[PDB]
Amino acid sequence: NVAELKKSFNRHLHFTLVKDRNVATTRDYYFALAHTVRDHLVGRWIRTQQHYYDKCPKRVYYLSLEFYMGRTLQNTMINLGLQNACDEAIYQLGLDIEELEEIEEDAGLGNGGLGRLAACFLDSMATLGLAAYGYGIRYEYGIFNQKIRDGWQVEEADDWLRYGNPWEKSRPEFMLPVHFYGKVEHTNTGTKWIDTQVVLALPYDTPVPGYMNNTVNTMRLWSARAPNDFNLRDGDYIQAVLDRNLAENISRVLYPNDNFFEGKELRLKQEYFVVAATLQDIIRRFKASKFGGTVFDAFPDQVAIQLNDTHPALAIPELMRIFVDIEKLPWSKAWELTQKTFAYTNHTVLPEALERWPVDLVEKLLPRHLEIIYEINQKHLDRIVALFPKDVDRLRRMSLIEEEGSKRINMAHLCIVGSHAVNGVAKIHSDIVKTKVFKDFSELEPDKFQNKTNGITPRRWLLLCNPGLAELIAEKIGEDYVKDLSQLTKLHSFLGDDVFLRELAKVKQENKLKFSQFLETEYKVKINPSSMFDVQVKRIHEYKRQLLNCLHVITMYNRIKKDPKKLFVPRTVIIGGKAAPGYHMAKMIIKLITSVADVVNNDPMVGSKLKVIFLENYRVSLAEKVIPATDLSEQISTAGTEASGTGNMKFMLNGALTIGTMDGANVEMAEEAGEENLFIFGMRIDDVAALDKKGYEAKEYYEALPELKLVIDQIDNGFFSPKQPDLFKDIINMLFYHDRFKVFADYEAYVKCQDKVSQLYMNPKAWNTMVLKNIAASGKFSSDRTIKEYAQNIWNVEPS
Amino acid sequence: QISIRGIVGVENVAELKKSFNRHLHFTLVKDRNVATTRDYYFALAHTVRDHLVGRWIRTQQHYYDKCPKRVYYLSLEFYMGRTLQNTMINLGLQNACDEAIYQLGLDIEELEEIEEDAGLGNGGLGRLAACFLDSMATLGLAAYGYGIRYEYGIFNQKIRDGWQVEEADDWLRYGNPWEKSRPEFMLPVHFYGKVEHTNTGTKWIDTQVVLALPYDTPVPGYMNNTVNTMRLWSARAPNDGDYIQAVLDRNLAENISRVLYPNDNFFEGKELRLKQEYFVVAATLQDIIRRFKASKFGSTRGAGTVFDAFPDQVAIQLNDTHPALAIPELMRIFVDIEKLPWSKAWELTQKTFAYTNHTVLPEALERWPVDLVEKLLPRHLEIIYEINQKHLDRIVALFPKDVDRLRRMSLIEEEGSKRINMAHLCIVGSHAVNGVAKIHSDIVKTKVFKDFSELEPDKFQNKTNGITPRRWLLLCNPGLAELIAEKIGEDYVKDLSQLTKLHSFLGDDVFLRELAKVKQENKLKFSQFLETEYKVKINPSSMFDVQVKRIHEYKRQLLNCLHVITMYNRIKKDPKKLFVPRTVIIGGKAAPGYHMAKMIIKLITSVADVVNNDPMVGSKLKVIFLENYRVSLAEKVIPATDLSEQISTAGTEASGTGNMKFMLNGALTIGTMDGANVEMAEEAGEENLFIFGMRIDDVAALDKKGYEAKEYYEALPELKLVIDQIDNGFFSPKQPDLFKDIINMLFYHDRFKVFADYEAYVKCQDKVSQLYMNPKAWNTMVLKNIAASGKFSSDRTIKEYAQNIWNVEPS
Ligand SMILES: Cc1cccc(Cl)c1NC(=O)Nc1cc2ccccc2cc1C(=O)N[C@H](C(=O)O)c1ccccc1
Ligand SMILES: Cc1cccc(Cl)c1NC(=O)Nc1cc2ccccc2cc1C(=O)N[C@H](C(=O)O)c1ccccc1
């Protein structure tokens, strides 16, 4: 097999890259290897499509505006069982596979957790043999490349397709028209949506290999193209051709907002674009099937469509439009079938994230969908009036339309009424969703609302990113854990095995040494090998409280400066993440962190006790490097704000201990591992509510806590910005008068908890014993467990 | 060519079938149960490209190892057409691929018809570049084509309510299996900014950057081991406000390579066009210099790289003035970047460049406003001014008392808005200037650039155009190619002058019938196409009378239309009188902004409607406006043609190349003594062409006298009738005034003297009809045309450029 891989590599270099080795580039070698690897899954890819056609399993369609896929080469090698043989083949060719792997651009087609969940799910669904396709947009530009210039974030275009993508296949044959604008006529042959502008949707297919099985599923991503046909309704010829750019702009760039709604028309076009192309494709495949007594009675027995957040909410009225206006089904039948087809996953309760589209905007762009939405709402409110004749406010609360001045469509409400199942993403969150946020809806339909706790794939997030740990675990308990991560509980038998604990520590140490080389190469800071790696990587947000971590960094710095001879447990503090470009406070927080880092790293009285890195361009491939090197994972969102989290799970699986609040899935991590094996601190959700009731006065904490006062005064008075002493005035103002996330209220408990972490870190046996308990309890957080639950309780499909 | 018989030939076919199936599977990722005809086309295309990779690599190695002098053909246009069949033929793989595809149960014609034209040109100029690439590869020259990878080539033409409409030519929609992107050779191109004159010298600063990403297409020689390269540049925004809008605004940089300017023989001074011209020049020159420095002739001294040997290792041909900015750009690189003394840099520049002039029509001449150039390319304006100053200083020295000569010879047109005469820039910056046919090159030398050729009497040359006999005989007319080979062997393909051996069959009635049979087969096949696309019943015994070329006043499709109406009126006047039946086909694109050309199309379609539907005419006369004329369609209609219409006003068509294609493929020519028509008459004998009308001196005499169109209208009853019908609404009854603009032009503003050639043209046409009634005489004349067409091989043309301009040797 090694010999044939080398032969295949050389054939691709020659015929595919059209290069003699004398003038080949590193990129050429990457592409030759990529093609060699892709070739190994084509047979199963084709045979999987045949199998689904032949056997007609119910299909699952995961519809998302985001797929945060990272790099594909190593993941594909691992899932096909080819990694070791490819490593050896490339070595024999006089190359280094790790160098080739670094050439590949991330498919950064998402913002954070939501998009990464979609990615993990694809992997899990393929590994479980489900007839599942991911449907999304092939953005020409993904999440921006982040650079730091003078300590500030600057954005560069993520031109990930510049040199091509060997992991996609365009299928222009399957191109479909999407309509916009136009007008509606209610004719005696049905409602017609006419005089529209057309944009074509060209699909690109990327293979999704199951881990060591026969399944290769598909991620189909749509790209926007201008139509070619002359219309009699049709100026400068050259400008007309250039203006084709306007249609093509629909798939140009991912909106870089994490947990934040921006009601831009282009974003609405993206949402409808993906929905319209996807539903047409699904219906085409259904009609071509052996199920293709009218045509669509079997549709929800053959089709499940999962809505990833409310971003593809328009799928609901689009399916109704197709059923009623095109296929001529009665409204009642169409609506029955629609509800049985769709399920909706809610990912946040933060109000700034909620999608509320102005009715005037929807009327202009999608007049027929607005009609359909108004009719869904009418039939919905008619029911509520029937059940609660007197409750006028309940009608207001439950309407899909918010009438308060500027009328807006509540897309979450649309998703709830149009779906048979609604789930949150962690127990704490799903409860809030059910019993608070959508109380009025769950009361009327109790069985609709569910929980499906998030998860992560142990292929990318253990086998790939941490082969040392994966190997060590395999050596002790075999490799069944890869496909059933609950098998990690067997590691509990090795508590008290001191040789094993040393082996476990050595794996972490090797990871840290490797990541330290990266850090020294990229940042030219000298890393203390014996320091605790204290890491907070996630999107920059007020709710995630990178700011709270920064206060702790400054607290540590001041303690060292005040007592230089005192025992200090050394740390490398790493904070990274992107800020949404329009998010002013997040950008200020990045500048604060880089400003602190500059002072701390260059103070000769501090030296190797404490180094601070703002980790630039945080993304999936970089997550894979830092996570395995981490000792302490920071998961410190205000209680009630992080729906689940998944970075938390990645760190747990990779041998880090967690400092965190009782928020999102942190709560379930504590349940699985034991609360005493996490560093839990701070206000619980009820404590936060009590402070809201009483009223939050940040000044009181600043006055009462001397260490906080010095930290805040330093920030406020130019200690970290001597050339611009008032630089951080907006942060200070926010902290004292507009802090929705109560940073000062958790500061004391946070610092005391951090003190306990440092104490435990001085005791390697105790530390590593606690680590083992975390790894051994991490099995619940496999996305294979998550997908099995969706399959059984939402989609009604069986792993195969 | 590769055998399909015996042990080895069976294996050749077997390997091709295996490769096809491998590509369908691994490349297209399709089970045959779901494969489309397009999938099969791509699987074959990939297979065929695989078969030239070895030679392509070994060609590059050979040029590196032996360092022959390289020829770089720099053009804004490469009108390449389809590549699959051309490549199969040149590699000797057509028979084997045909057999493989047949054994797979597929129709290779259907697969071939899937391919989009690479329509990256407007007409003759762009197609000449394409023929040249084929010939340069066939002759083993170390030659690359350099151009722009337009996302959209020449628009697709449709006819709606009788008018041209344009659709975007989205030729890359399904991908291009021929090209290979080369990311690592990306180069920056600079725009705007300003010039700083400092202690360290002149710097061009504060510029905007656009990246140029090259894509390589293989250019296989006919039956040799050479595969040359066509490198086409694509514009990208650099890597490095509303964030979203900043990302969308990257479209502005990428717009530089978005679309081919669809003007044929017409200058439109648009800023985007100037950007295109600089883009291709800047990326190309950087790439050429990089290759030179990497070569065995690359060496460094105290200043750095010695460029002394540069013009011994590099020739750059400027296809028209479109890449004229190459001259000041090479000077900019030499002087500003490499720090060469101006004098030395200018000497090297002149020895490197040669310029081909393609037209003397004034509306075609590039004259860029200096203010536009100052804005976009401020350093190039400075360099152009300095070239002009030193140029005029020499003229002052030689002709101290001739002030008007300075005005005439300046690169700058000073009157009103100052403009740069790009032709003048090309002449002074080049060591050789050539026109494209004897008559044209003489006008260029002795009239248009008289002041320059007097000063430098050896600079000016002629290189008569040619066409490749691969695409334009072997490929498009296999029936004729086979017949010729049966009679005289297959050595004509590489030495087309061997066609004179066909004179052995003068008076051989068996051969003359064979020639007619080939034409008839072509006509029947093409008639099937016409009846599928058009509501017409084609008379299979009719003469196919064809005028296909871009729509222009100078090319006089309008004159042809007057003859069509004349024929119609004769039939109506005397329905029982004998009439030699014709199918009149006129085709070509109009530039979208060219009002008169668009009116002429509408006239032709309006006439067609009347003629085709008049029951008194019936099968005597049918008229077709052939839509979307382009290279692949030219390959179909040309071999089906009996009479080739080449009727430009004397002095206006620099050469023409359609004329040559028709001659090679067994049509007789009706034409004026213009461009290469004059040379076709020389080769075949003037008595074997239907030559008519004013010659160039007659046109000059009429200009001097003053042209009064109404005199012809009053003197020629048949013309009067035609014009009155057009003017009065006979061809536009629902809109009687529709053709007012055509009538006004013809009477008061006709620079091309349509009425002045009408009488001679119609009389000449009468002679054609008479000959067509005598198949033996007709086909005897055809034989004499085919037999004399050897001069018009572009292999002959390229050998002359090689010897007399580039100083390179066929290998
Ligand atoms: C087939 C082909 C066509 C165009 C360009 C390339 Cl890069 C390729 N591939 C390729 O293999 N090129 C060469 C192979 C060689 C093999 C042995 C010895 C020399 C070789 C040179 C090339 C080659 O194309 N070199 C390019 C060039 O001549 O354009 C060279 C390389 C680096 C900088 C400048 C030019
Ligand atoms: C690997 C792959 C992934 C996605 C799409 C395709 Cl077209 C391919 N290639 C492919 O060969 N697909 C199929 C092969 C089959 C072989 C035997 C029997 C049935 C097969 C079906 C497919 C296939 O993908 N068909 C598509 C589909 O299921 O998406 C089908 C075809 C035409 C209209 C609608 C759907």
Ligand SMILES: *Cc1c(COP(=O)(O)O)cnc(C)c1O
């Ligand atoms: C896992 C992951 C996330 C989500 O992290 P959280 O801490 O749960 O917000 C975001 N970005 C990347 C690149 C990830 O891999």
Ligand SMILES: *Cc1c(COP(=O)(O)O)cnc(C)c1O
């Ligand atoms: C050969 C050719 C031309 C040039 O034709 P002329 O009659 O010489 O102007 C123009 N267009 C196409 C498609 C051609 O093949």
Ligand SMILES: CC(=O)N[C@@H]1O[C@H](CO)[C@@H](O)[C@H](O)[C@H]1O
């Ligand atoms: C709208 C949005 O991006 N929500 C995010 O979704 C992911 C995946 O469910 C959660 O882990 C995270 O807590 C939450 O902030």
Ligand SMILES: CC(=O)N[C@@H]1O[C@H](CO)[C@@H](O)[C@H](O)[C@H]1O
């Ligand atoms: C500017 C331009 O396109 N000129 C054209 O060039 C071709 C190629 O030489 C000639 O055959 C033709 O007569 C001439 O009109």
Ligand SMILES: Cn1c(=O)c2c(ncn2C)n(C)c1=O
């Ligand atoms: C105020 N604000 C923003 O303005 C913002 C954002 N994310 C993106 N943007 C622009 N978030 C989370 C936010 O709170």
Ligand SMILES: Cn1c(=O)c2c(ncn2C)n(C)c1=O
């Ligand atoms: C007047 N005119 C035009 O306007 C024109 C053209 N070709 C393109 N355009 C726009 N020609 C040849 C022309 O003579």
